[PDB]
Design an enzyme around this catalytic site. Structure first.
Site, PDB file in Angstrom:
ATOM      1  N   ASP A 273       0.840  -1.218   0.000  1.00 31.09           N
ATOM      2  CA  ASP A 273       0.000   0.000   0.000  1.00 31.09           C
ATOM      3  C   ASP A 273       0.855   1.239   0.000  1.00 31.09           C
ATOM      4  O   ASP A 273       1.682   1.400   0.885  1.00 31.09           O
ATOM      5  CB  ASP A 273      -0.785   0.096   1.292  1.00 31.09           C
ATOM      6  CG  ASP A 273      -1.927  -0.774   1.316  1.00 31.09           C
ATOM      7  OD1 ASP A 273      -2.722  -0.622   2.284  1.00 31.09           O
ATOM      8  OD2 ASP A 273      -2.038  -1.597   0.383  1.00 31.09           O
TER       9      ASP A 273
ATOM     10  N   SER B  90      -7.322   3.503  -3.551  1.00 32.35           N
ATOM     11  CA  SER B  90      -6.955   2.085  -3.517  1.00 32.35           C
ATOM     12  C   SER B  90      -7.980   1.165  -4.176  1.00 32.35           C
ATOM     13  O   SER B  90      -7.625   0.108  -4.705  1.00 32.35           O
ATOM     14  CB  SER B  90      -6.708   1.632  -2.078  1.00 32.35           C
ATOM     15  OG  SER B  90      -5.563   2.273  -1.550  1.00 32.35           O
TER      16      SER B  90
ATOM     17  N   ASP C  57     -11.032  -4.147   3.394  1.00 35.50           N
ATOM     18  CA  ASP C  57     -10.412  -2.991   2.777  1.00 35.50           C
ATOM     19  C   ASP C  57     -10.231  -3.233   1.284  1.00 35.50           C
ATOM     20  O   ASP C  57     -10.300  -4.363   0.812  1.00 35.50           O
ATOM     21  CB  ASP C  57      -9.089  -2.623   3.447  1.00 35.50           C
ATOM     22  CG  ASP C  57      -8.823  -1.107   3.420  1.00 35.50           C
ATOM     23  OD1 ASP C  57      -9.490  -0.357   2.664  1.00 35.50           O
ATOM     24  OD2 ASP C  57      -7.942  -0.678   4.194  1.00 35.50           O
TER      25      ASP C  57
ATOM     26  N   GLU D 171      -1.104  -8.446   0.536  1.00 37.25           N
ATOM     27  CA  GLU D 171      -1.025  -6.999   0.678  1.00 37.25           C
ATOM     28  C   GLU D 171      -0.415  -6.589   1.989  1.00 37.25           C
ATOM     29  O   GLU D 171      -0.943  -6.959   3.018  1.00 37.25           O
ATOM     30  CB  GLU D 171      -2.420  -6.411   0.634  1.00 37.25           C
ATOM     31  CG  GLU D 171      -2.352  -4.882   0.666  1.00 37.25           C
ATOM     32  CD  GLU D 171      -3.563  -4.189   1.216  1.00 37.25           C
ATOM     33  OE1 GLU D 171      -4.467  -4.797   1.807  1.00 37.25           O
ATOM     34  OE2 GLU D 171      -3.636  -2.958   0.991  1.00 37.25           O
TER      35      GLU D 171
ATOM     36  N   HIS E  96      -2.647  10.816  -1.365  1.00 39.69           N
ATOM     37  CA  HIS E  96      -1.948  10.049  -2.398  1.00 39.69           C
ATOM     38  C   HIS E  96      -1.653  10.872  -3.658  1.00 39.69           C
ATOM     39  O   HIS E  96      -2.131  12.011  -3.815  1.00 39.69           O
ATOM     40  CB  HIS E  96      -2.662   8.732  -2.710  1.00 39.69           C
ATOM     41  CG  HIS E  96      -2.584   7.742  -1.591  1.00 39.69           C
ATOM     42  ND1 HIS E  96      -3.570   7.627  -0.634  1.00 39.69           N
ATOM     43  CD2 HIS E  96      -1.625   6.844  -1.253  1.00 39.69           C
ATOM     44  CE1 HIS E  96      -3.225   6.699   0.242  1.00 39.69           C
ATOM     45  NE2 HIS E  96      -2.054   6.202  -0.115  1.00 39.69           N
TER      46      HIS E  96
END
Lengths: 434, 433
Positions: B48, B99, B150, B319, B396
């Site tokens: 991530d 994401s 998530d 992940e 981000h």
């Protein structure tokens, strides 16, 4: 016959549809196998985009080509990796995680890490030979092209060994690099060492420093321009005079001085400002009217240098720097300038078949691509891209590893993680220099 | 095929040649890294926020500037990929993905809008690489140190119009078309249980305490539903370790934390002029980490052991989660991911028919800056393995970023690609239709 250049890695269809945003049309294993040779490089062309990290490449692509577009030069090199460019603390010799241009240019040109601001010297202020000096010693033709002043760190690192990049001419050298000053027993200022190095082709800005007079030696009291004339250089100052040049070699080395400082930037736009993406309209970059057909572009200087240098039967080394002068339009236009020069290099290399072309940056700029609604504490700007959508850039240099890409013999040596100093050794070995 | 064994600086970094990471020409090594044979297995590892800047900062801190991540930095074939999303109404690019849209892109091969999981801009579902692997008879694994609801783990198993639709209650409110009681496929967690991967390991036990609103398991908690549907439920390292098989009769569901699993390292938050006004930071081990909670690497190894029993092959995604402006948390998360990548590469080198891919969904905004920097956002000075200060700044993002691979078909990550190409690379490597 030819190792392949990537012809089209734009999005292949409708980006809203399944598969429409693919940049590949099929498996790349055969293409990459066909991209690999360790035969000698006859020639090397190294292109450097000042500040051109992955973020800068992406922002420029988004703006000028659209998110799903493709730089026919920069994005076309088939072999890619990431390299590290940390400098050293001069006193401790420990890493300094954020280099300047001078320490990074020293690393790829000499294979030695150094302190920020050093050119062609290590942390003990000891000179080490450059790739250009070594190419010349082996009988190769040499070219040094930049849209910056030719005394700036990237072109200077090929030809000058000084303890501070500020030492442009006699007066700055006597002040800031006294051990290097000609009249204090050293090899001279950046400009004097450039004239000594005598590359076959040197093209860029930085006429201003050539008005200074030397303080010692055979050409004391003459300007450095007069010195160049007395030493047999062919001096040109515009596109037409550059075009009139038929040969460049050790008898008549070419020195093109196309601006008193940096050459003109491609594009204009407003500076980024605090909350600029919120408080000011989206920007469309505009052409710089100082750009004109009497001032050669980076790509035009690249093409002329290749023509002139490619006459040498043994081969040539050519470095081309697209200079950077928080102005998003200026920065993006500089990436566009570099892409055009990369295209010229690849066109030549594809045909010639023994030419290694390498495209990278000295270190990355701090710019980031951020959400349009961003409230950022630094400087921001909204831009109207080729997609008809807003991109926001934020300025909030830096230490991140960054892209290095290559095509031709020995290009495998940029893949994976490498150091900027490995680039020196890659070039040395590819040209068979000792 | 060779993994990069050591690309640390080879000597004294102050001496000529001492900072080189190469020892000689790489043409033969790279040629030997290229195979067009079928991949039996794929292991996709996602860090991530792990763009090139985060990789560099974590290397500088944990390994020194001239050090080497034995997992992350060892993959021989490298490129950069683009991860822009789409504006839902116009379909034009949105230059900065979340994401969910990025995970949708690599798992389905379709661009989408920020927040979408497994659906396109028209809210139409598209199959995921995990669903396709299972339909072809391959074993499937889905491992994360985040909550399993998530975006990144969810994208493999759920098709919902908003990533917020974790369970029945959020889905009824925010994704009414997907809600089970409204004729939809259900919440992220319900679709996860339907998808029935062979191995699912991560955090996010909290949402399993919700009860279904409809269907065969109406009124039972989603944990009760899992139990009723034959899942092996585990909740700690010993229980995970005691599992001897995982398959469609006995699929494994490991729920190791209520929310996200514990972060590796602690440190203070970055602050205004923190590199100037506060001392340099040395990261510390998180007391909540312990040998009763499996690490990302341990979950990766156990998944590989269980999935590798399938003779046809397996697909596994791993992940390393990122839980604001905390340099030590972020760097420790990259270290966690490097350990899992090492396990994947160790397996792949021995097995010989395994494609391992390491990349990120998008990059964090953090930057490595000069020690004396006075920056407008948040900054922190850190004492690195070199015994020097590194400063990080948060001030981000949309930058293209590294993707790297090892094994059959790894050529397809080299050069410029799009994140959607990764879907097609995985599909083609495994011979899925």
């Amino acid at each position: 016959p030819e190792m392949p250049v990537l012809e089209n890695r734009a999005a292949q269809g409708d980006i809203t549809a399944p598969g429409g945003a693919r940049r590949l049309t099929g498996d790349q294993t055969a293409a990459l196998r066909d991209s690999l040779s360790d035969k000698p490089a006859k020639n090397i062309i190294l292109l450097i985009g000042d500040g051109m990290g992955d973020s800068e490449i992406t922002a420029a692509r988004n703006y000028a080509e659209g998110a799903g577009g493709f730089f026919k030069g920069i994005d076309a090199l088939p072999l890619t990796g990431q390299y590290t460019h940390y400098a050293l603390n001069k006193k401790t010799g420990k890493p300094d995680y954020v280099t300047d241009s001078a320490a990074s240019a020293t690393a790829w040109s000499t294979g030695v890490k150094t302190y920020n601001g050093a050119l062609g010297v290590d942390i003990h202020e000891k000179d080490h030979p450059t790739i250009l000096e070594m190419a010349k010693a082996a009988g190769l033709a040499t070219g040094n092209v930049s849209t910056a002043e030719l005394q700036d760190a990237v072109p200077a690192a090929l030809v000058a060994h000084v303890t501070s990049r500020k030492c442009y001419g006699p007066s700055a050298t006597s002040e800031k690099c006294p051990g290097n000053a000609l009249e204090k027993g050293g090899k001279g200022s950046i400009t004097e060492q450039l004239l000594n190095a005598r590359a076959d082709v040197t093209l860029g800005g930085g006429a201003k420093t050539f008005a200074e007079t030397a303080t010692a030696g055979e050409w004391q009291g003459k300007t450095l321009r007069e010195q160049a004339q007395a030493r047999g250089y062919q001096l040109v100052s515009d596109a037409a005079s550059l075009n009139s040049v038929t040969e460049a070699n050790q008898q008549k080395p070419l020195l093109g001085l196309f601006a008193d400082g940096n050459m003109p930037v491609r594009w204009l736009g407003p500076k980024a400002t605090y909350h600029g993406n919120i408080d000011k309209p989206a920007v469309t970059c505009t052409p710089n009217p100082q750009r004109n057909d009497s001032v050669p572009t980076l790509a035009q200087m690249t093409d002329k240098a290749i023509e002139l240098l490619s006459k040498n039967e043994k081969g040539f080394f050519l470095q081309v720097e697209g200079a950077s002068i928080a102005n998003p339009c200026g920065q993006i236009g500089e990436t566009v300038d570099l892409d055009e020069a990369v295209q010229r290099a690849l066109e030549f290399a594809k045909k010639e078949g023994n030419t290694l072309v390498i495209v990278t940056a000295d270190h990355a700029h701090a710019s980031q691509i951020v959400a349009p609604d961003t409230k950022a504490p630094g400087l921001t700007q909204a831009l109207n891209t080729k997609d008809g959508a807003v991109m926001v850039m934020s300025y909030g240099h830096t230490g991140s590893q960054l892209r290095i890409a290559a095509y031709g013999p020995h290009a495998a040596n940029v893949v994976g993680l490498t150091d900027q100093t490995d680039l020196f050794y890659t070039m040395k070995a590819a040209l068979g220099l000792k």
